[PDB]
Coordinates of C-alpha atoms in Angstrom, one line a residue:
Chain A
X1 CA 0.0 0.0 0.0
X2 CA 1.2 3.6 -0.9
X3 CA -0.6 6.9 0.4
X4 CA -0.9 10.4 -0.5
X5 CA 1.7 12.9 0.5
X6 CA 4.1 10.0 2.7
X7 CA 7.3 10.1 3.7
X8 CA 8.9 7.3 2.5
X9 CA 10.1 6.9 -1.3
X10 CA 9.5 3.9 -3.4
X11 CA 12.2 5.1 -6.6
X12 CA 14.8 6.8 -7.1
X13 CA 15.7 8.7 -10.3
X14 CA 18.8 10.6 -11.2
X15 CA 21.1 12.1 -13.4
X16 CA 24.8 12.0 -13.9
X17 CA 25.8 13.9 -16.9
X18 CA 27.1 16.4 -14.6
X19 CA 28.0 16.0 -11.1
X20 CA 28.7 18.3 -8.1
X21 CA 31.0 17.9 -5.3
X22 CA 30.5 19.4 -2.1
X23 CA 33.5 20.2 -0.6
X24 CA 34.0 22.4 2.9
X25 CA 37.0 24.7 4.1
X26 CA 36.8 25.7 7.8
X27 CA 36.2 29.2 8.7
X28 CA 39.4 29.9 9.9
X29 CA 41.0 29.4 6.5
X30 CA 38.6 32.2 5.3
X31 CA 40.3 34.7 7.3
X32 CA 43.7 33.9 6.7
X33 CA 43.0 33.9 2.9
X34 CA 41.4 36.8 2.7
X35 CA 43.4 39.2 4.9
X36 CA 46.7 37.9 3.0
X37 CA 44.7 38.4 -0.2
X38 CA 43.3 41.4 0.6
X39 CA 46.5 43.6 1.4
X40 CA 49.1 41.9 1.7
X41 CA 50.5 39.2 -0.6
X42 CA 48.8 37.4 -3.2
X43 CA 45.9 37.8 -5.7
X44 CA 43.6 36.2 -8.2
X45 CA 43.8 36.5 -12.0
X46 CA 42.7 34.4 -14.4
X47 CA 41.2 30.8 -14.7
X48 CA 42.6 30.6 -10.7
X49 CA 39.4 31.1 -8.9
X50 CA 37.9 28.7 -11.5
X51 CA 39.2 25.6 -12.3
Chain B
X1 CA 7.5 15.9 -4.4
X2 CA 6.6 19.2 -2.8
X3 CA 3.8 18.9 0.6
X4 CA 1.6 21.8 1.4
X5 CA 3.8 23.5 4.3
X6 CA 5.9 20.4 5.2
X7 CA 8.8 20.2 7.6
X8 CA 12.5 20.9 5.5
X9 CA 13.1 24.5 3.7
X10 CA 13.6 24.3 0.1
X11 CA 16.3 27.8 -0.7
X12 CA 17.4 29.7 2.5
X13 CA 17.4 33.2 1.3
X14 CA 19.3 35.6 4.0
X15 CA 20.1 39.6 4.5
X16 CA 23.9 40.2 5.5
X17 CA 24.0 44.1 5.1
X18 CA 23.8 44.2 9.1
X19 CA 23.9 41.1 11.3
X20 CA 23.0 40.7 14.7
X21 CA 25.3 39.0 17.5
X22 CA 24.3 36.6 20.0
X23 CA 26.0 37.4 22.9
X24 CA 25.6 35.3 25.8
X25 CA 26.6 36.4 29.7
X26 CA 26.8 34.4 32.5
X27 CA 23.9 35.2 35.4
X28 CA 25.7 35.0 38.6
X29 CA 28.4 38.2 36.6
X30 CA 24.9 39.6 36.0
X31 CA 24.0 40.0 39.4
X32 CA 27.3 41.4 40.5
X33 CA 26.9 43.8 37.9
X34 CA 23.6 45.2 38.8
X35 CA 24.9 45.2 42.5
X36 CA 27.9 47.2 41.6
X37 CA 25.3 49.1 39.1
X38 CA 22.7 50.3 41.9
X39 CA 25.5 51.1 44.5
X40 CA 27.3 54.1 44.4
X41 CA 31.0 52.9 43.1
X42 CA 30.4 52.0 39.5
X43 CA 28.4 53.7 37.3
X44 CA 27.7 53.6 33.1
X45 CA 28.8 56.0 31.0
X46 CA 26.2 58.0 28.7
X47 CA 27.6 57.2 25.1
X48 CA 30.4 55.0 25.4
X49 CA 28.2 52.1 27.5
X50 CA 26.7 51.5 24.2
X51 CA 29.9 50.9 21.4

């Protein structure tokens, strides 16, 4: 028996031509990229932030 | 599938221009502050007591 609305699933479709990776930096990196990149140091140009 | 009203969000969409800040303060410092407050040693200031 299946119902309207439920919770539970009964398939699963999906698609793979593209496919995303979620990947996590802490916080603290944040800050000590951005306040070196900021003033000091080092920038971005290019296909840096991209690829 | 999409339920009238149900439990998860779908998109969270958020305002940074200000933020607030959750500070939290210990009670028993509380009450040695109002103490100190409604006696006569310390008092508040009139514009710096809210930077």
């Amino acid at each position: 028996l299946v119902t309207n609305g439920q919770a539970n699933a009964m398939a699963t479709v999906q698609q793979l031509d593209p496919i995303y990776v979620d990947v996590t930096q802490p916080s603290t990196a944040l800050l000590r990229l951005r306040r070196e990149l900021a003033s000091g140091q080092l920038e971005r140009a290019g296909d840096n932030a991209a690829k």
